Amino acid sequence: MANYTNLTQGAKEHEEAENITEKKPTKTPQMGTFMGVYLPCLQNIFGVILFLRLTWVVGTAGVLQAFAIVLICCCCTMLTAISMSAIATNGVVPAGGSYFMISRALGPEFGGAVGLCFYLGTTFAAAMYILGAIEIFLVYIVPRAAIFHSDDALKESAAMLNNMRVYGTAFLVLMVLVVFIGVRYVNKFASLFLACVIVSILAIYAGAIKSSFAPPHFPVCMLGNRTLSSRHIDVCSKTKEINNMTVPSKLWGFFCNSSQFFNATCDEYFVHNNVTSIQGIPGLASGIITENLWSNYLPKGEIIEKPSAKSSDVLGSLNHEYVLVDITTSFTLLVGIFFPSVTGIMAGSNRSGDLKDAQKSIPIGTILAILTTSFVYLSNVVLFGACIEGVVLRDKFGDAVKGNLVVGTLSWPSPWVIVIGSFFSTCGAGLQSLTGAPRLLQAIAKDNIIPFLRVFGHSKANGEPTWALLLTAAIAELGILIASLDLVAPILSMFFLMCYLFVNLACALQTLLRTPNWRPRFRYYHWALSFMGMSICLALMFISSWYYAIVAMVIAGMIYKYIEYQGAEKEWGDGIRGLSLSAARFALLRLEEGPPHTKNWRPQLLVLLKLDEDLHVKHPRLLTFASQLKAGKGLTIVGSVIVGNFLENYGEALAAEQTIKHLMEAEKVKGFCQLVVAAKLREGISHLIQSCGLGGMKHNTVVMGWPNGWRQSEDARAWKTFIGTVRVTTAAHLALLVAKNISFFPSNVEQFSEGNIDVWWIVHDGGMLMLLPFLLKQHKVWRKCSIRIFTVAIQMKKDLATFLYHLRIEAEVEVVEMHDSDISAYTYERDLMMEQRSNVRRMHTAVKLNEVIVNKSHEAKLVLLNMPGPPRNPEGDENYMEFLEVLTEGLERVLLVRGGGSEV
Amino acid sequence: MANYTNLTQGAKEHEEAENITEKKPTKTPQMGTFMGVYLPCLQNIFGVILFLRLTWVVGTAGVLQAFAIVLICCCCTMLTAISMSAIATNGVVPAGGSYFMISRALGPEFGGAVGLCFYLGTTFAAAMYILGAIEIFLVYIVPRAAIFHSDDALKESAAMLNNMRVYGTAFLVLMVLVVFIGVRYVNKFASLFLACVIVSILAIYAGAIKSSFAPPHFPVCMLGNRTLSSRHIDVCSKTKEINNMTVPSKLWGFFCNSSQFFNATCDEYFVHNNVTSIQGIPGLASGIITENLWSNYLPKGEIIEKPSAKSSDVLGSLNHEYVLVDITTSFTLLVGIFFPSVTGIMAGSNRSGDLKDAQKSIPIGTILAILTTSFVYLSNVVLFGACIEGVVLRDKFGDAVKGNLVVGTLSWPSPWVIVIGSFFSTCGAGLQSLTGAPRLLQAIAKDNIIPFLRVFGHSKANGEPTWALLLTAAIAELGILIASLDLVAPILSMFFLMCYLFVNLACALQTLLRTPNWRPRFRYYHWALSFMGMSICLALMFISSWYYAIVAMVIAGMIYKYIEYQGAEKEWGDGIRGLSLSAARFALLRLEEGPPHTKNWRPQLLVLLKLDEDLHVKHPRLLTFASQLKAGKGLTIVGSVIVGNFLENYGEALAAEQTIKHLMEAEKVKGFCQLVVAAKLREGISHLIQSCGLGGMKHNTVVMGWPNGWRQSEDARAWKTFIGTVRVTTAAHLALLVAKNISFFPSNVEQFSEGNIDVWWIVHDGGMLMLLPFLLKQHKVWRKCSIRIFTVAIQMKKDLATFLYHLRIEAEVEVVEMHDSDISAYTYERDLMMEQRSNVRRMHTAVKLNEVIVNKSHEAKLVLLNMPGPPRNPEGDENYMEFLEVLTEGLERVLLVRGGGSEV
Ligand SMILES: *[C@@H]1O[C@H](CO)[C@@H](O[C@@H]2O[C@H](CO)[C@@H](O[C@@H]3O[C@H](CO)[C@@H](O)[C@H](O)[C@@H]3O)[C@H](O)[C@H]2NC(C)=O)[C@H](O)[C@H]1NC(C)=O
Ligand SMILES: *[C@@H]1O[C@H](CO)[C@@H](O[C@@H]2O[C@H](CO)[C@@H](O[C@@H]3O[C@H](CO)[C@@H](O)[C@H](O)[C@@H]3O)[C@H](O)[C@H]2NC(C)=O)[C@H](O)[C@H]1NC(C)=O
Ligand SMILES: *[C@@H]1O[C@H](CO)[C@@H](O)[C@H](O)[C@H]1NC(C)=O
Ligand SMILES: *[C@@H]1O[C@H](CO)[C@@H](O)[C@H](O)[C@H]1NC(C)=O
């Protein structure tokens, strides 16, 4: 015993859940995977197409191409089920419908785009289902009752369209009144609607099976190879004997105007050929499948011809009774006419609030429902191919079979069971889609995702959409005005296809780009599956209509970008400013949840500009050289400290910030400026070195200016601060670039005709040292210079040579033998590193280093040079600075470099 | 006297310019707008289509639809000229070709996408132009010389294709050898090629004019309304009298097999109708334009019928001599066949290195060239409509006119002038495109934008592309294998259309999004123009072929995203990490060049977390409340200071940073963490408050915890620091949120059943105070509470009421009259503000504020409360803290708020 429903859950349920945040009522509706996602998805996938148009599709396509159609459609919907299940497992499943899951998983932008595309899909589905109920009622149930009587022969077809427009509008107003007053009854009878569907399908299968031994007696009159309609004919014989008199039969009256055979003038085809009774449903074992295994695709108005029976060759006798192809078919038309029979998988998660284990019921339930419906469709394709005549199939309005539903002829009890089950099922699906479209519309309105839809957020006392439903009815009316399933189906399919394409693309993107909170806990979901689904039914969209597809893509893109703009203006306060703000924040967040290191090391600079007492940059060359080093790409944070109290220097801080920004723009530096007003310059710099940049956009190198004239100045703070900064950089594990004689560094406008960047590779930290000159040579200033590596001190050397080879930029390496004592400070530091994982000697060896370095590189344009670490005791800081100063004595332009990190 | 060229400038020139950075040789090639951009664009727009296919297009389309075609094509190319001129004016114009301008203006990603799409365009253009030269040579000049002789009747069509494949491949190998050896000769004779084009067009116009009084004698034999071919017939008469004997004419031999009229069996149409000589070129004043003003669009193999002459009605006599429609035409086919006649506008800026005033010559020159060619095409459409028979036009191979070029019949001297001018012009355009395609390819390779194309960067001694040209020849070969202009033209047009679509879309985007360095200094460029162009010829792309267009879009999208990925990996060092890094940097940069303020104010928080001596967050509730306030969206920077020396606390800093990150993730705070190891907690906080965040992603509110137990602690630093931070926030012009009793703030899991957020709006800073509660109520925790504004102190009040109404969230405002003395500290501060633009009294009035505030709001869940500024003298800091403490004495949870900024 159960009272379940297949409808959706809109804002009313999501709100109930959110309020229930802070139960016995909830526990009772809890439903297992079967009755919670299998049956809702099954009842919503089985639409009207399977009946009113599957026989026609099989016939006009040939079992092979019909199999291809059903398989392609089922493939898009299955890959979308896998992607939607990936969405279902990821994170908590909201209590609302599938829209809320998709929204909370893909962000409001995709949520709103998918919501509106799926909503237009559902409205045009209410239109197609009402058209189908009207077509079944009007063509098969009560043909006599029509608003417009059949007039002449040319207009009779138009009269049917008018009959459908008027009847469909009346029926749509009825369905809207029903959903508005008494949707509870729809919930109550969803089970009866599913019963009708399943009884109908079992009747189809029972008929197909019974058709093996005892097939039914539905014969078709056929004149030669020209199929005749049997709506008015009684006997498939030229002369109908009456009262022992061979009076001519009515068909004579329909091909000959005498009607008394008194020297009757019968047309050509009638006199030559013969009328025959062809069994319309041969046995399943009869083997007709071999006959109808091939496409027909006859254009509009062509007579339907069985290519089996005999025939004369005369032509010209065009007649009304000849059953005609009612639409110019094609493959791309058949896929569109058939696709709205696989839509409805989002209904699998339309009942997610009333579930027990959502992430477990929804994926399995949805995929099993799609497997069931795909098997039903792919099996019925073959059964129709192998049980129905290849001519009764192409009859799209049950002509030639006395006006019975084509699939109806295959049933155990009678075609009536199917002709009524399809009518009740199709009106039930119409009611379902007139409840599912406005609930989704009020959920998109209540989310305030899109502003102008705010009017439709208004709900009834019970939380029913009063003003969303009216718009849904208006759009369904616009649909019904095209009173033909064959023309509404491409539009419906295009909207649902856009919904499925976005659901597959958002998943593929969020899996590739490592979007935060994208944890698809599914045992079989791989982004290639969602991508293959997106591709399959992008192709499906375009195949069915290349102009409708572009219109849908542009509509969805505009809704998406407009939702993004409104979200920006909502959270940041401005439209485009806030849009870029959100882009930056989202990129940085995505940047956080990832491996901290990078497979390659690239210097992201923090230029430490020193501000004089006039608050002017004491070294613009720092910026010039930073621009040359980064070449306008990458991250360059220009930091500077203003000594003083912040409470009274805010104006100065703003002025100096504008100054530094103008200087950066003048030196073609693309980057950011940050000023810290600090009480102590050393502490200000120690805070800039470790705090610049938003998390994930940190620097990794600190570019400093050498403290020129340290000995001359009486104050010892200037030289002692540089060492303090060096220690801070080393402790923070950042690279260090101490530029010396920076006043002589070349400007952005001048160039070097010829020169040598003399990188000195010493025992360790070879990665940064080698990488620098090439980044410099990539700039126009240092473009025309050569590179010479004067190595002083096996496996690492070989690795370096290989890395240079990969670099592909010409560089010559020379190894100069040096006494260990001369390089003692280096070897000492290296030993300290290996174990981790004097002054007179240091100076007397630094002068040897001077001898070699000047003798080899005196005339270089830029001498890179590895650094030794600062002393452990801060007492030998003077000795350390003297060591550096002598080590660099006599060189024109030195870039002291210290790795101090895992640089690769 | 001048020796100019119309070719492009590749890497060789761009490199020369860059080297010349640091002249007499350059000055001599300087060329004015006319000979620099007008004539190159004019010589490259006038292709083969105008001749070999314009007459056919006019005929098979009708002057009206042909006018529509030419106008739509010219409209896309004109809007693209406007967008390309906007690119040309913006910034310095590089010396290379149009590729370099487009690259430096739209970034390397669009540069490479446009480069490759335009390159495939140019290669398939070399294929079409070689096919055209072969078709002209083979069909009109020397029909007798063909590799394959006519095969039967129907096959003869296939034989022509083989004749074209073999001749075209031979000609393509010739053109490749010519461009490889002696491109200088191509530069020398570009002027002769332009001469041929212009002489040909003036000959067309002179013929059209001469056709007013004296039209030429090109008659056409027509049998009834069936046009006959005249390649073999001599007299348009059934019987050709020979030697005074009325012997039957050859056409008798082509419709009757007797050939001697001895009881000849002539077919039906021949015996009934009559052969007539219809003047093929009636006068311009004859008025035939009224006849050919309508489309024909006859499908393949249909006989071309003049709907003017008399005719019998018998049918069946299918014959070889009946001129047939050679391709199943349609509008969408004609637009594709005609579009490669408007392409070539990027050649306007193919000579930008040798210009005087680039930003002035290129826009005017290009637009004038497009106006000239559009006028020539739109004028020739009408002239062909009004001068050529409506049957000679639909003849696509000069049949029925004795095998002469259709447009050739309209010329002053003879059709020979045009038939040779078109051949020389088309081989010249083939040479041009086999020099323009490989130059562009080596420029895309040398830029190292795309890695795998690196092989093609290899150049000859002079800087000619040795290995790019071979690939261009291979792709042109693949094109020639489809030996028909009518089938190569859609592919060429699709590639060039993709190039133009990207050139229009990049401009529209960079204008809307305010991309840095996008200064379009043009007097008429508006992004709506570029957008309209993008839309027009996106429609053109899809119209011509919906599957080729998707293939082109996907190819261009993949090249674009792959270039973006390679740039990320190049500059940042990682692929996806670096990709997000570049996205963030670009967003922040774009964010810098904009108005600093925002039309709306939204709190971007800096949570100041206090770290205890155990290095644990002393107040997680700060984070919880920050999460509730921002609701997971926006910017939240969690800053904290570790007291100590950074040189030895790096490990602790990393540990505490991980701790704070885990806490943030536990409290659902999405944001970033920054630790500053400082010598003094107060100075560390003063540096965090002013330095957090990358420029443009700054905070604007500082969220602090109240210094609980300030009086109990003997140390006065704890209470004095809070005031110092308040002063720093106020001076920095940031908002301030002092949370008091923060240990009692509700957690993210619990909720409030019912409660009142009692915002106290006091004299000023009403914007932040009102905005806060609504952001709080937007969270599930504070969702179920109400809001009560207890205003204490006209126009501003009305503005506040209106703002509350806009907010749309229910709130009740109560104004309580209070004595000015009680609010003295507030009124005093307000007066200080108005002028800019005791303690016993303060305490005795704070207790009155206590009386009122507790009597009204004692049981509130959260009391917001405006703050007075800190005292000017730092001596009264104890009095200020006592004032605050009493003012908040007895309230459960207080959020002291201070605006101190231009909050709106
Ligand atoms: C149903 O019967 C009609 C009556 O003959 C068929 O019409 C004619 O069918 C032939 C195929 O048998 C069509 O092609 C013809 O083929 C012969 C084979 O040699 C060829 O000699 C003819 O020139 C022609 O190509 C023919 O077009 C068609 N119509 C006429 C006016 O003859 C009809 O095809 C039959 N239906 C099916 C499905 O076969
Ligand atoms: C060139 O001459 C031929 C020879 O008659 C034309 O063929 C026939 O042209 C008529 C139009 O006059 C086509 O339509 C017919 O119209 C009459 C008008 O009453 C109608 O009674 C017929 O039933 C038919 O609809 C006809 O299809 C066409 N072919 C045959 C076999 O008759 C041809 O149209 C002429 N070309 C042009 C451009 O007019
Ligand atoms: C029509 O029927 C007669 C006798 O039943 C038969 O002889 C004739 O061949 C038939 N014609 C065709 C086209 O089958
Ligand atoms: C053919 O020509 C004869 C005499 O010139 C004329 O009488 C007849 O009407 C013509 N037939 C047609 C169809 O014009």
Numbering used by the authors:
A (entry chain A), B (entry chain B): 102 to 123, 126 to 896, 903 to 946, 1028 to 1094
Q: What is the paper's account of this structure, in its own sentences?
A:
Potassium‐coupled chloride transporters (KCCs) play crucial roles in regulating cell volume and intracellular chloride concentration. They are characteristically inhibited under isotonic conditions via phospho‐regulatory sites located within the cytoplasmic termini. Decreased inhibitory phosphorylation in response to hypotonic cell swelling stimulates transport activity, and dysfunction of this regulatory process has been associated with various human diseases. Here, we present cryo‐EM structures of human KCC3b and KCC1, revealing structural determinants for phospho‐regulation in both N‐ and C‐termini.
